[PDB]
A paper describes a structure:
[name] is the exclusive zinc transporter specifically expressed on the apical surface of intestinal epithelium and responsible for dietary zinc absorption. [name] knockout in mouse is embryonic lethal, and loss-of-function mutations of [name] lead to a lethal genetic disorder, Acrodermatitis Enteropathica (AE). Structurally, the LIV-1proteins share a similar topology: a transmembrane domain (TMD) with predicted eight transmembrane helices and a large and variable N-terminal extracellular domain (ECD). In this work, we present the first crystal structure of a mammalian [name]-ECD at a resolution of 2.8 Å, which reveals an unprecedented dimer centred at the signature PAL motif.
Residue numbers in the entry:
A (entry chain A): 37 to 60, 64 to 144, 151 to 228, 262 to 305
B (entry chain B): 42 to 76, 84 to 145, 152 to 164, 171 to 205, 209 to 230, 256 to 305
The structure:
Amino acid sequence: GQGALDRVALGGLLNTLAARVHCTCGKCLSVDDLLALGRPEEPGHLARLSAAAALYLSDPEGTCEDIRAGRWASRADHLLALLEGPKALAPGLSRLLQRIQAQTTEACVDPPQLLREAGVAGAPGSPGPVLATLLEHVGRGSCFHTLPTPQYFVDFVFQQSHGNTPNISVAELAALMQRLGVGWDTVCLSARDVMAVYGLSEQTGVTPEAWAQLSPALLQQQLSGAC
Amino acid sequence: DRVALGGLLNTLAARVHCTSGPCGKCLSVDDLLALHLARLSAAAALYLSDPEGTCEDIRAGRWASRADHLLALLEGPKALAPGLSRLLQRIQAQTTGACVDPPQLLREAGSPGPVLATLLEHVGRGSCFHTLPTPQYFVDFVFQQNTPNISVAELAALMQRLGVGGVNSSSDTWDTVCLSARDVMAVYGLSEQTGVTPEAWAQLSPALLQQQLSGAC
């Protein structure tokens, strides 16, 4: 009866997953794995399944290893958690789709659209239904496009600039200002001056939050032409 | 004592380099008498701020008024520190052009009256001043250099001026994306109908920098 439909339905879901990843790593994935995740009646079973699938798309090799270890359900509940967090969902989804793009291989589907399409009356969807909505799109063979996330732009400067400190050194800050052609209207600020404006201790250096804070001044300094 | 006022006059005149000039001659002890500590310190700060302009005001008998005004502009809630900065900028312009900043003056002083008096002391020692803008100033500036907000089009002109907006072995595949103005807005969930508000400009600033440092355009 249902055992059998579930097996054809879930079986087909597994087959599209395997295909989109080009694992048609595919052997490890079986209907019984998907069955193992939960009893359909349990509230948050669609979520757990949608997340488990998203994980598979996100990391096939890694998700087989987890499946073998019998921790697929746990790792799926973990992802729902990461995304259930305060302001976590939108950027978490972006990162998740970037990975799914990586492993997946004209207009395409983006996270804002997925957030719209799940959830109600202009509000963003919550993780389970959002991920389901993602799955349903994978099933329709939609392509995905993602823009980067706000944190990505600050993170990027900390990864790119070569420094032993966890924060940006006044020296580091000054090298960057140089690369940008920098370091009332017409004053030209030093790196130190920049720090002084935002009440930043040179011993403490520039943290990511701080980089974000002093960003407008770096722009102004460039547009100003003062330097 | 008009002996004291006399010396005050002489430093004021000197630090502005009006000693053997007409702008120094307009300043008379009786002017200073006509003008209490606060009013005097402010009147003097004004003179240092704008000698030519302050003679015209003095000769019109409105020096006291203009001085009470400056005390007002500085009496306010979070007015004093930045007001003092702007004032010192002007005074550095007219006199000269290891330094003293407004936090130091506030500490050494002890509101506006005694602070101005301490500024004046420093002018007397010949100290140099170092003054900074406020964080708000940097956002507020871009908006001048006319919808109320910045248009997507405006945003795009700015990105062009910065060499971005599109007008090898990447650690992240986003490292290669070159964002449109519209994309920039999309990242931060900003409506194109509303435009870029100052708070929004602040928010999207890091991406403009990244886009340049990235070399993706």
